[PDB]
Enzyme design. Structure first.
Site, PDB file in Angstrom:
ATOM      1  N   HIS A  61     -32.869   6.038  66.143  1.00 19.58           N
ATOM      2  CA  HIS A  61     -33.339   6.077  67.545  1.00 19.58           C
ATOM      3  C   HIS A  61     -33.713   4.683  68.022  1.00 19.58           C
ATOM      4  O   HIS A  61     -34.872   4.397  68.324  1.00 19.58           O
ATOM      5  CB  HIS A  61     -34.520   7.037  67.690  1.00 19.58           C
ATOM      6  CG  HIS A  61     -34.225   8.445  67.286  1.00 19.58           C
ATOM      7  ND1 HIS A  61     -34.732   8.967  66.121  1.00 19.58           N
ATOM      8  CD2 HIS A  61     -33.520   9.409  67.927  1.00 19.58           C
ATOM      9  CE1 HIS A  61     -34.305  10.221  66.056  1.00 19.58           C
ATOM     10  NE2 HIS A  61     -33.578  10.536  67.133  1.00 19.58           N
ATOM     11  N   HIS A  65     -28.324   3.156  69.759  1.00 19.52           N
ATOM     12  CA  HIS A  65     -28.179   4.545  70.180  1.00 19.52           C
ATOM     13  C   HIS A  65     -28.230   4.627  71.708  1.00 19.52           C
ATOM     14  O   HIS A  65     -27.418   5.319  72.295  1.00 19.52           O
ATOM     15  CB  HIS A  65     -29.259   5.453  69.527  1.00 19.52           C
ATOM     16  CG  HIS A  65     -29.329   6.865  70.053  1.00 19.52           C
ATOM     17  ND1 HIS A  65     -28.283   7.747  69.893  1.00 19.52           N
ATOM     18  CD2 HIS A  65     -30.349   7.516  70.666  1.00 19.52           C
ATOM     19  CE1 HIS A  65     -28.674   8.889  70.443  1.00 19.52           C
ATOM     20  NE2 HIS A  65     -29.927   8.806  70.894  1.00 19.52           N
ATOM     21  N   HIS A  99     -33.602   6.879  77.591  1.00 21.92           N
ATOM     22  CA  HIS A  99     -33.886   8.217  77.082  1.00 21.92           C
ATOM     23  C   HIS A  99     -34.696   8.381  75.813  1.00 21.92           C
ATOM     24  O   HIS A  99     -35.325   9.430  75.676  1.00 21.92           O
ATOM     25  CB  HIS A  99     -32.639   9.103  77.052  1.00 21.92           C
ATOM     26  CG  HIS A  99     -31.870   9.030  75.776  1.00 21.92           C
ATOM     27  ND1 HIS A  99     -30.968   8.041  75.535  1.00 21.92           N
ATOM     28  CD2 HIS A  99     -31.911   9.859  74.718  1.00 21.92           C
ATOM     29  CE1 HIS A  99     -30.528   8.244  74.306  1.00 21.92           C
ATOM     30  NE2 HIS A  99     -31.046   9.351  73.790  1.00 21.92           N
ATOM     31  N   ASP A 100     -34.641   7.415  74.873  1.00 26.89           N
ATOM     32  CA  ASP A 100     -35.417   7.453  73.609  1.00 26.89           C
ATOM     33  C   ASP A 100     -36.367   6.228  73.511  1.00 26.89           C
ATOM     34  O   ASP A 100     -36.641   5.743  72.410  1.00 26.89           O
ATOM     35  CB  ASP A 100     -34.456   7.542  72.395  1.00 26.89           C
ATOM     36  CG  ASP A 100     -34.065   8.949  71.959  1.00 26.89           C
ATOM     37  OD1 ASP A 100     -34.833   9.890  72.221  1.00 26.89           O
ATOM     38  OD2 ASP A 100     -33.021   9.094  71.309  1.00 26.89           O
ATOM     39  N   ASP A 210     -25.934  12.471  74.258  1.00 27.34           N
ATOM     40  CA  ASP A 210     -26.877  12.260  73.152  1.00 27.34           C
ATOM     41  C   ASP A 210     -26.255  12.543  71.750  1.00 27.34           C
ATOM     42  O   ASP A 210     -26.582  11.847  70.792  1.00 27.34           O
ATOM     43  CB  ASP A 210     -28.136  13.108  73.342  1.00 27.34           C
ATOM     44  CG  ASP A 210     -29.363  12.647  72.582  1.00 27.34           C
ATOM     45  OD1 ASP A 210     -29.476  11.428  72.317  1.00 27.34           O
ATOM     46  OD2 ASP A 210     -30.254  13.490  72.332  1.00 27.34           O
ATOM     47  N   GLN A 262     -23.854  19.773  57.860  1.00 25.35           N
ATOM     48  CA  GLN A 262     -23.028  19.236  58.935  1.00 25.35           C
ATOM     49  C   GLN A 262     -22.058  20.293  59.482  1.00 25.35           C
ATOM     50  O   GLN A 262     -21.949  20.442  60.688  1.00 25.35           O
ATOM     51  CB  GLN A 262     -22.271  17.989  58.453  1.00 25.35           C
ATOM     52  CG  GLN A 262     -23.171  16.795  58.181  1.00 25.35           C
ATOM     53  CD  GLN A 262     -23.932  16.380  59.419  1.00 25.35           C
ATOM     54  OE1 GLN A 262     -23.362  15.860  60.379  1.00 25.35           O
ATOM     55  NE2 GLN A 262     -25.217  16.701  59.472  1.00 25.35           N
TER      56      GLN A 262
HETATM   57  C1  LIG Z   1     -32.577  19.075  63.771  1.00 22.27           C
HETATM   58  O1  LIG Z   1     -31.528  19.596  62.966  1.00 22.27           O
HETATM   59  C2  LIG Z   1     -30.365  18.889  62.814  1.00 22.27           C
HETATM   60  C3  LIG Z   1     -29.585  19.264  61.714  1.00 22.27           C
HETATM   61  C4  LIG Z   1     -28.369  18.614  61.418  1.00 22.27           C
HETATM   62  C5  LIG Z   1     -27.617  19.066  60.199  1.00 22.27           C
HETATM   63  C6  LIG Z   1     -27.904  17.552  62.288  1.00 22.27           C
HETATM   64  N1  LIG Z   1     -26.712  16.904  62.075  1.00 22.27           N
HETATM   65  C7  LIG Z   1     -26.312  15.950  62.890  1.00 22.27           C
HETATM   66  N2  LIG Z   1     -25.197  15.234  62.827  1.00 22.27           N
HETATM   67  N3  LIG Z   1     -25.200  14.380  63.916  1.00 22.27           N
HETATM   68  C8  LIG Z   1     -26.288  14.584  64.648  1.00 22.27           C
HETATM   69  C9  LIG Z   1     -26.485  13.728  65.834  1.00 22.27           C
HETATM   70  C10 LIG Z   1     -27.127  15.499  64.080  1.00 22.27           C
HETATM   71  C11 LIG Z   1     -28.322  16.125  64.355  1.00 22.27           C
HETATM   72  N4  LIG Z   1     -29.173  15.736  65.407  1.00 22.27           N
HETATM   73  C12 LIG Z   1     -29.034  16.373  66.697  1.00 22.27           C
HETATM   74  C13 LIG Z   1     -29.655  15.555  67.822  1.00 22.27           C
HETATM   75  N5  LIG Z   1     -31.012  15.117  67.366  1.00 22.27           N
HETATM   76  C14 LIG Z   1     -30.913  14.152  66.240  1.00 22.27           C
HETATM   77  C15 LIG Z   1     -30.321  14.861  65.045  1.00 22.27           C
HETATM   78  C16 LIG Z   1     -28.688  17.187  63.448  1.00 22.27           C
HETATM   79  C17 LIG Z   1     -29.887  17.884  63.661  1.00 22.27           C
HETATM   80 MG   LIG Z   2     -34.563  11.843  72.235  1.00 21.53          MG
HETATM   81 ZN   LIG Z   3     -31.261  10.351  71.792  1.00 22.30          ZN
END
Ligand SMILES: COc1cc(C)c2nc3[nH]nc(C)c3c(N3CCNCC3)c2c1
Ligand SMILES: [Mg+2]
Ligand SMILES: [Zn+2]
Length: 305
Positions: A61, A65, A99-100, A210, A262
């Site tokens: 973050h 990003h 945004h962050d 995002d 994933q």
């Molecule tokens: C909270 O649970 C999860 C779980 C998994 C397995 C996640 N896998 C991801 N791969 N890429 C991104 C991006 C990403 C995630 N995010 C979504 C947006 N917030 C940041 C983290 C993920 C969020």
């Molecule tokens: Mg955010």
């Molecule tokens: Zn973000």
């Protein structure tokens, strides 16, 4: 450079190898989308540099990003230019860059569970309400008000576009928003001249932007996963010190569960996001196709290839 001016227009574009050029890439995008006489260049340049200074040195973050999210918005706006007003286009590009702001690498649930001062101050969308409050503080610094030339009415409207855009980046809100838009589209009820429908479509654009790190080429998408996970594991380590067992994705002793984590995230969150976005805005289809390609790369890791 003339080389990049052509590539910036494409959805798959990775800013990664051009770090010194990121502030200039943002200025160029505001200029091509909103016009070269939209903002006073001296004021815009101070604002961009103060925003950069208020992103922390965290693995995910961070400043990179912010520019990645802003570039995705620019490409959506360029492929659907006339569906939005000049105030929305400028408000949304600014909202994405901000945004962050001041993210400390911790999620809303950690701040609410350990009753941090920000959680008392903001009970829902904790960090997103903080990100908006930081955006207003930077706008109020001497010589940073990029919206000085607007009428008092247009200033209030653009801040309200930004507020709703930043709050929509709370993933907890995305699930309910996407289900409504999917119903409105199938029943033929969706209407962009309805202000309530407009705000929901903007909210889904913010989610799509995002999460755009899942729409890059595979070598880039997999290097971004390392950065998200270094943040998740550092949060899980703190929960362990405070006597609370963390969820698997935040546990550094459960890395084997990542490819399957994933696969679930792409099937349940990312693919439906880009599917619904393509139905509403057909020119955004390349984001959905790139997402399907990285889903199939995660399928290959699970099967041992
Ligand atoms: C909270 O649970 C999860 C779980 C998994 C397995 C996640 N896998 C991801 N791969 N890429 C991104 C991006 C990403 C995630 N995010 C979504 C947006 N917030 C940041 C983290 C993920 C969020
Ligand atoms: Mg955010
Ligand atoms: Zn973000």
């Amino acid at each position: 450079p003339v080389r990049l001016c052509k590539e910036i227009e494409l959805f798959h574009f990775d800013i990664g190898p051009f770090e010194n050029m990121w502030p200039g890439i943002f200025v160029y995008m505001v200029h091509r989308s909103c016009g070269t006489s939209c903002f006073e260049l001296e004021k815009l340049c101070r604002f961009i540099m103060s925003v950069k200074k208020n992103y922390r040195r965290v693995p995910y973050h961070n400043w990179k990003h912010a520019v990645t999210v802003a570039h995705c918005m620019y490409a959506i706006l360029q492929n659907n230019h006339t569906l939005f007003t000049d105030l929305e286009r400028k408000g949304l590009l600014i909202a994405c860059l901000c945004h962050d702001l001041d993210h400390r690498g911790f999620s809303n649930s950690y701040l609410q569970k350990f009753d941090h001062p920000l959680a008392a101050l903001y009970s829902t969308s904790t960090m997103e309400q903080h990100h908006f409050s930081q955006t207003v503080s930077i706008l109020q610094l001497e010589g940073h008000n990029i919206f000085s030339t607007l009428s008092s009415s247009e200033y209030e409207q653009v801040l309200e576009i930004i507020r709703k855009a930043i709050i929509a980046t709370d993933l907890a809100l995305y699930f309910g928003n996407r289900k409504q838009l999917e119903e409105m589209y199938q029943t033929g009820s969706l209407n962009l001249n309805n202000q309530s429908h407009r705000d929901r479509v903007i909210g889904l654009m913010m989610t799509a932007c995002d999460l755009c790190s899942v729409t890059k080429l595979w070598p880039v998408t997999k290097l971004t996963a390392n950065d998200i996970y270094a943040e998740f594991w550092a949060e899980g380590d703190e929960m362990k010190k405070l006597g609370i067992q963390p969820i698997p994705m935040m546990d550094r002793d459960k890395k084997d569960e990542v490819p399957q984590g994933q696969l679930g995230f792409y099937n349940a969150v990312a693919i439906p996001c880009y599917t619904t976005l393509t139905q509403i805005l057909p020119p955004t289809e390349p984001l959905l196709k790139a997402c399907r390609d990285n889903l199939s790369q995660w399928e290959k890791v699970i099967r041992g290839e």
